[PDB]
C-alpha cells in the first residue's frame, strides 16, 4: 500500500460521499441506460477507479483526476441536462476538482 | 363524415406509412420513456390525431398540421439526436409538411 495509494483512497472516499445514492458506484449497463455503450466509448465509475488504485495503475494525482473527469463527462454526455444525473455530474466535477486542488 | 374528414384521413394514412414501426402510433408512457411527462407538456401521437379527426376537432388543414408538428417537435425534444426516434421525427416532419403542401 504505497503513499500514492493512501492519497488517492482519501480523495476517492471524499468524492463518493458527494454521490449518496451511488449513481456513480458501478459500471452503467445498457439495460438501465438504453444505447449507453454505443454513445460512451470509455466507461468509468468509482468502483473501477478503486480497482485501479489497488492495481497501482495511477502514478500521479493528475492521472486519477483524468479518470474522475472522464466519469463526469460521460454522465453529462449521456444524460439530458434536466436530469438528476446530469446535474449531479456537473456539481461533483467542479467541486471534486476544487477539493483535489 | 365531412369533406375535411376524408382529406385529413388521407393525409394521416400517408404520414402513418412513413412510420412503419409504429413509434408514433400511440401515447408515450413514462414507463417506456423515463421523465417523459415532466419534459413534454402536450403529448400527441397518430392515434390521438385520428380521434380528433373523428370528433371533428380539426376545422382546417392548418390545425391538423400544427398537431403533426407538435408530435415531431416532442420527439425531437425528448430523444437524443443520435437515436432512431429523433432522426425519424426530423425526417417525417419536413417530408410530411412538403406532402401536405
Amino acid at each position: 500500500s504505497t503513499p500514492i495509494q493512501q492519497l488517492l483512497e482519501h480523495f476517492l472516499r471524499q468524492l463518493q460521499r458527494k454521490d449518496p445514492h451511488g449513481f456513480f458506484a458501478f459500471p452503467v449497463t445498457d439495460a438501465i441506460a438504453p444505447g449507453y455503450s454505443m454513445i460512451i466509448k470509455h466507461p468509468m465509475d468509482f468502483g473501477t477507479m478503486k480497482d485501479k488504485i489497488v492495481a497501482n495503475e495511477y502514478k500521479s494525482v493528475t492521472e486519477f483526476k483524468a479518470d474522475f473527469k472522464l466519469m463526469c463527462d460521460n454522465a453529462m454526455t449521456y444524460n439530458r441536462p434536466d436530469t438528476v444525473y446530469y446535474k449531479l455530474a456537473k456539481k461533483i466535477l467542479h467541486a471534486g476538482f476544487k477539493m483535489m486542488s | 363524415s365531412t369533406p375535411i374528414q376524408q382529406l385529413l384521413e388521407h393525409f394521416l394514412r400517408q404520414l402513418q406509412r412513413k412510420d412503419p414501426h409504429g413509434f408514433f402510433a400511440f401515447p408515450v408512457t413514462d414507463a417506456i420513456a423515463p421523465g417523459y411527462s415532466m419534459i413534454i407538456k402536450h403529448p400527441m401521437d397518430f392515434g390521438t390525431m385520428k380521434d380528433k379527426i373523428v370528433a371533428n376537432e380539426y376545422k382546417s388543414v392548418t390545425e391538423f398540421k400544427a398537431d403533426f408538428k407538435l408530435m415531431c417537435d416532442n420527439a425531437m425534444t425528448y430523444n437524443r439526436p443520435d437515436t432512431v426516434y429523433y432522426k425519424l421525427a426530423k425526417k417525417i416532419l419536413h417530408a410530411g409538411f412538403k406532402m401536405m403542401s
Binding site: V28, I32, A33, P34, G35, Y36, Y78, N79, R80, T83, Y85 | V28, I32, A33, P34, Y78, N79, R80, T83, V84, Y85
Partner: peptide, 6 residues
C-alpha cells in the same frame, strides 16, 4: 429511472 427510450 435513467436514459430515454429503447
Amino acid at each position: 429511472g435513467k436514459g430515454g427510450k429503447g
